[PDB]
C-alpha cells in the first residue's frame, strides 16, 4: 500500500501508484478521483451524491461559476438547446 484488515473494499485490489499519502489516510479514516480508481462503491456513492448537490437547482452559468468550466457554446448552440430544453422537455 504505497505512494489485510478492512483493506479489501477496493476491487482494485481484492502497492499503489495513482494515490498519495494524505489521500490514502482519508480513505482508511473510513479524492472521488480515487474512491473511483479503487472501486469502493459506497464512497463513490458518498461523494458523487453530495457533489450532485453543488449542482442541484443552479443555473448553467451558476454551475460553471461554482466549478470551473469554460462555457464552450456558440450562442447559436446555447440558445437552440435552451429552446429545446424548455419547450419540449420541461
Amino acid at each position: 500500500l504505497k505512494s489485510e484488515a478492512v483493506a479489501l473494499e477496493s476491487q482494485t485490489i481484492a502497492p499503489l501508484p495513482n494515490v498519495t499519502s494524505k489521500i490514502l489516510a482519508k480513505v482508511i479514516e473510513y479524492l472521488i478521483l480515487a474512491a473511483n480508481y479503487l472501486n469502493i462503491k459506497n464512497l463513490l456513492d458518498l461523494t458523487c451524491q453530495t457533489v450532485a448537490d453543488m449542482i442541484k437547482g443552479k443555473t448553467p452559468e451558476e454551475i460553471r461559476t461554482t466549478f470551473n468550466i469554460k462555457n464552450d457554446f456558440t450562442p447559436e448552440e446555447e440558445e437552440e438547446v435552451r429552446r429545446e430544453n424548455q419547450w419540449a422537455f420541461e
Binding site: N36, A52, P60, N71, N85
Partner: protein, 567 residues
C-alpha cells in the same frame, strides 16, 4: 471525468436540473443525454418523436400529454388530435429497454397497445389518464403479453367495454402486479380471475376496483391482499346483515398498511363504519362518489387525524367542515364537489363559511378546489389572511358572474387578496362577477402563478393584457366566454413564446387577428378550431369559436382534422 460524471449525474433526476446540466458545456450536454432515463413531454405537438428519440437514446420512461385541459369541459371536438401511435411507432424501434409510458388525454388504440406489448419486453408501467380509443381487446393484449407488468392504471379513461374477459388473459405465471386501477371500466371483470390474480401477486399495493365488484365480495379480496396501501372499493351497497358487516370489518382491519381509500359508489351509510379500523391511519380519502349525508361524513372524519387529502361532495356542509377544521390538523388539500350543479338554489347548506373554517383550522391547507353557490370578499380576504402558504386555489361559484352577496360588489378585491397574500400561489382559477380590475391585481401580484383559468370575467382586452404583461411565471392560460380579443393578444405576442399554450374559446378573437399572429410568429402554432366551415367563408373580423395557441419546435402538425387550421 466521464465515469464519475455519469455517477454524479444519476443522482440528478429533476427535469429542470437535467436541462440545467445539459447546458453547462458541450461535454456535460453529451454525458447527460446518454444517461437520461425519463422524458416529460408536456405537450406532444411541441416536438417530434424523432427529435426526442435522437437526443435521448437510452430512455426508460416516457410521459406525454395530449389535448389541453379544457377537453374535460367537452370543449375540444373529437378528431382534434392527441394521437399517440406515432410516438409508439417511433419508440418501438428505438427504445428496446423502455419500461414506462404514462399518457394524459391522448388517443390510444388497440393497435398501440398491441405494439407496446410486442415491442417492449421490460415493459412495467402503463398509466392512461383520461384517454380514449382502445377497448378491452386492447387490454387483453397487455394482460396476455407483458410478462413483467407492475402497474396498469386507467384513471378516468374512457374505454370501449367489449367484455370483462380481458383480465383472465393474464397468464398464471404472472405475479408482478403492484398497482391496478380499473375504476373506469364498466365491463364486469370475472371475479374468480380477479381473485386468483390478487392472490398470486404478493407485491400488489394499490387496488382500485370497478363498480361491478359488489360490497359482498370485497372482504374476500382483502383477505388475499393484506398488504394493500391503497384501496378503491367496488360497489358499496348491500342488504344490511351483520355477517356481511363483520366480514368487512375483519378483512379491512387485517390491512394494517392501508393509507388511501376511495370508491364507495352508492355507499350505504350502515356499511361505512366497517372502515374505522383504517381511519386512524388514513392520509387520503376520496368520498366523491358517495352521497352519504353530513353527520355520516362527520362520524367518519373524527376518526381520521392523519388525513392529508380530502375529496367529498357538498353534502359535507359547513357543519361538516367546521369539524374537519378542528379534527385534521394535517390537512394539505381539500376538494369539495357539487352534488347538484344544475340547480341555482341550495340543496345542501354549503356556504363560504365552510372554506373560511377550514382555512383558520388547518395550518397546512395549501390546495383547494371548492364549489359553492355564494361568496364574499370578506371570506376571500380572511382565507387569504389565514393561508399565506396557499399554492393552488380554484373557486367555482355555481351561478356565473355572481357578486359578493352581502355588498353586491364584484369579487375583485376578494381574489386580489388571495394573489397579494399567497406569494407562492402557482395555480388559480376564478369565478363570480369580476371586472378588469382583478386582472390588474393578478398582473401586479401573481408572480409565481403558472396556471390560470377564467370564464365569464373581465371587461376588455385590458384584462388579458394585465395578465400577459404581469405574470412572470405564467405557463398555461385558458379562457372562455370573456370579452378579450385581438388587442391584448397581438400587444403581447412574444409572451406566448414563454408559455406552454393559450385556450380562448367563445371569446372575441377574430380570424384576421389569428392570421396575423401566425405570420408574426412562425415558431408558435396558432390553431383555429371551428366547426362552421372555412374561416374565409366569413369576414376576417368575425370571432373564431376557439383558438389554441402553443410554442413548438416541430412546426405545424400533420394530423389536423378538417375543422382545424394552422396559420
Amino acid at each position: 471525468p466521464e465515469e464519475v460524471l455519469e455517477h454524479v449525474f444519476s443522482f440528478i433526476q429533476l427535469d429542470k436540473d437535467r436541462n440545467s446540466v445539459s447546458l453547462v458545456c458541450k461535454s456535460w450536454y453529451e454525458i447527460e443525454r446518454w444517461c437520461r432515463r425519463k422524458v416529460f413531454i408536456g405537450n406532444c405537438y411541441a416536438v417530434s418523436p424523432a427529435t426526442v428519440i435522437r437526443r435521448f437514446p437510452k430512455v426508460r420512461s416516457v410521459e406525454l400529454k395530449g389535448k389541453p385541459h379544457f377537453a374535460d369541459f367537452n370543449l375540444v371536438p373529437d378528431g382534434w388530435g392527441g394521437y399517440v401511435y406515432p410516438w409508439i411507432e417511433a419508440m418501438s424501434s428505438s427504445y428496446t429497454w423502455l419500461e414506462e409510458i404514462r399518457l394524459k388525454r391522448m388517443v390510444v388504440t388497440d393497435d398501440c397497445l398491441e405494439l407496446i406489448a410486442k415491442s417492449f419486453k421490460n415493459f412495467k408501467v402503463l398509466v392512461l389518464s383520461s384517454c380514449e380509443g382502445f377497448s378491452t381487446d386492447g387490454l387483453a393484449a397487455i394482460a396476455a403479453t407483458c410478462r413483467n407488468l407492475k402497474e396498469l392504471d386507467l384513471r378516468e379513461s374512457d374505454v370501449d367495454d367489449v367484455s370483462g374477459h380481458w383480465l383472465s388473459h393474464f397468464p398464471d405465471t404472472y405475479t408482478s402486479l403492484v398497482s391496478l386501477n380499473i375504476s373506469c371500466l364498466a365491463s364486469e371483470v370475472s371475479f374468480s380471475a380477479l381473485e386468483r390474480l390478487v392472490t398470486r401477486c404478493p407485491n400488489l399495493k394499490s387496488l382500485k376496483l370497478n363498480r361491478a365488484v359488489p360490497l359482498e365480495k370485497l372482504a374476500t379480496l382483502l383477505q388475499r391482499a393484506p398488504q394493500l396501501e391503497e384501496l378503491g372499493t367496488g360497489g358499496y351497497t348491500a342488504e344490511v346483515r351483520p355477517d356481511v358487516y363483520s366480514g368487512l370489518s375483519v378483512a379491512l382491519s387485517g390491512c394494517k398498511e392501508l393509507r388511501c381509500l376511495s370508491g364507495f359508489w352508492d355507499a350505504v351509510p350502515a356499511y361505512l363504519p366497517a372502515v374505522y379500523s383504517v381511519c386512524s391511519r388514513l392520509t387520503t380519502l376520496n368520498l366523491s362518489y358517495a352521497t352519504v349525508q353530513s353527520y355520516d361524513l362527520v362520524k367518519l372524519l373524527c376518526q381520521c387525524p392523519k388525513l392529508q387529502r380530502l375529496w367529498v361532495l357538498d353534502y359535507i356542509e359547513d357543519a361538516g367542515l367546521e369539524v374537519l377544521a378542528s379534527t385534521c390538523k394535517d390537512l394539505r388539500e381539500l376538494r369539495v364537489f357539487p352534488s347538484e350543479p344544475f340547480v341555482m338554489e341550495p340543496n345542501v347548506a354549503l356556504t363560504e363559511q365552510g372554506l373560511v373554517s377550514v382555512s383558520m383550522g388547518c395550518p397546512k391547507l395549501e390546495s383547494v378546489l371548492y364549489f359553492c353557490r355564494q361568496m364574499t370578499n370578506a371570506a376571500l380576504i380572511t382565507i387569504a389572511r389565514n393561508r399565506p402558504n396557499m399554492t393552488r386555489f380554484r373557486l367555482c361559484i355555481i351561478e356565473p358572474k355572481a357578486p359578493d352577496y352581502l355588498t353586491l360588489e364584484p369579487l375583485d378585491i376578494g381574489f386580489g387578496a388571495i394573489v397579494e397574500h399567497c406569494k407562492d400561489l402557482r395555480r388559480l382559477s376564478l369565478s363570480g362577477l369580476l371586472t378588469d380590475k382583478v386582472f390588474e391585481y393578478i398582473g401586479t401580484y401573481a408572480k409565481k402563478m403558472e396556471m390560470l383559468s377564467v370564464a365569464f370575467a373581465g371587461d376588455s382586452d385590458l384584462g388579458m393584457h394585465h395578465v400577459l404583461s404581469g405574470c412572470d411565471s405564467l405557463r398555461k392560460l385558458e379562457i372562455r366566454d370573456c370579452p378579450f380579443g385581438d388587442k391584448a393578444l397581438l400587444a403581447n405576442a412574444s409572451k406566448l413564446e414563454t408559455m406552454r399554450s393559450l385556450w380562448m374559446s367563445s371569446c372575441s378573437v377574430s380570424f384576421g387577428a389569428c392570421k396575423l399572429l401566425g405570420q408574426k410568429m412562425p415558431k408558435l402554432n396558432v390553431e383555429v378550431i371551428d366547426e362552421r366551415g372555412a374561416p374565409d367563408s366569413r369576414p376576417e373580423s368575425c370571432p373564431v369559436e376557439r383558438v389554441f395557441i402553443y410554442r413548438t419546435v416541430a412546426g405545424p402538425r400533420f394530423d389536423m382534422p378538417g375543422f382545424v387550421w394552422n396559420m
